[PDB]
Design a protein around this ligand. Sequence first.
Ligand code: HEM
Ligand SMILES: Cc1nc2ccc(F)cn2c1N
Length: 289
Amino acid sequence: LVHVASVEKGRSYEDFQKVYNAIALKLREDDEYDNYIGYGPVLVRLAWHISGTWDKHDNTGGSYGGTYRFKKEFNDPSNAGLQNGFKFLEPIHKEFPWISSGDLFSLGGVTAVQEMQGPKIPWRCGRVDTPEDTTPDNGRLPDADKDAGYVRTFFQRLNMNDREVVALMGAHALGKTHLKNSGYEGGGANNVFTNEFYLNLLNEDWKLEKNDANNEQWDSKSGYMMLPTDYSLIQDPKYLSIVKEYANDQDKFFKDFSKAFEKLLENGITFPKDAPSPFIFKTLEEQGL
Ligand code: HEM
Ligand SMILES: Cc1nc2ccc(F)cn2c1N
């Protein structure tokens, strides 16, 4: 099963920078969402969930087809809460209806990371909307109530190694859990991209507890929380070494996250030899906007 990237007809870097800017301007304008966290974190999560359905074995799922727009995927219990990100992107799509759905969802995540002061994430266009019967079944996204062995095995399906996994999980510094979405709650909240996930793992005093949804989670007396899968990154000795590396080197974390996140968003896509080079978008700040 081959998905060849096909550039939206007549579009170039400038066209996509305009879409980036519209997303970024709306992030600034709709600042009140989720108790003033804003839409940044949920857009990052949306980009990951549309990509994380991928299966390397048969090239099903992945970001290419934009299939989150169909009810089966939209209503995946694993995707509860992401409807907010979809609703955010709706007026963007109306302003730029030429962009494919997969390109819009993935660009939303890139824009959110960069506007939240994260690393630059190179991004490629050319995802093409595929029909409803290409939507992956529910159940391909990861469970949170598991251990390091589960995490490691799960991410092999996405062709991610230990370093890539630990780097990607640093996104859990962003946003927060919501009891009504996932059965996890707490840990305060944040909308600036940093390496604080790793610092909190290492520096906080953690205690395993059951929450009000009867689910296990690790809680600190500072009020932070870790999922069992988050905490597994310091229980496993191979993950722990990488956690320490990122806790002690902000730039290295940024660079490795950028590579892993681009890879995540591009898994399953075949790019022609003469496809455009990846785009690196300027932030609003860099443009004086
Ligand atoms: C073992 C892997 C993972 C598990 C089990 C997991 C699980 C979860 C859960 C349960 C939530 C709470 C959702 C809610 O209640 O609204 C969440 C939120 C979030 N996840 Fe993950 N996740 C994983 C990997 C990732 C990755 C790889 C990324 C991105 C690179 C990511 C980005 C996010 C973000 C940004 C949020 C905050 C969303 C918001 O504030 O609305 N996660 N995740
Ligand atoms: C601040 C914060 N953000 C997240 C995102 C996902 C997750 F599972 C936990 N998180 C915590 N504690």
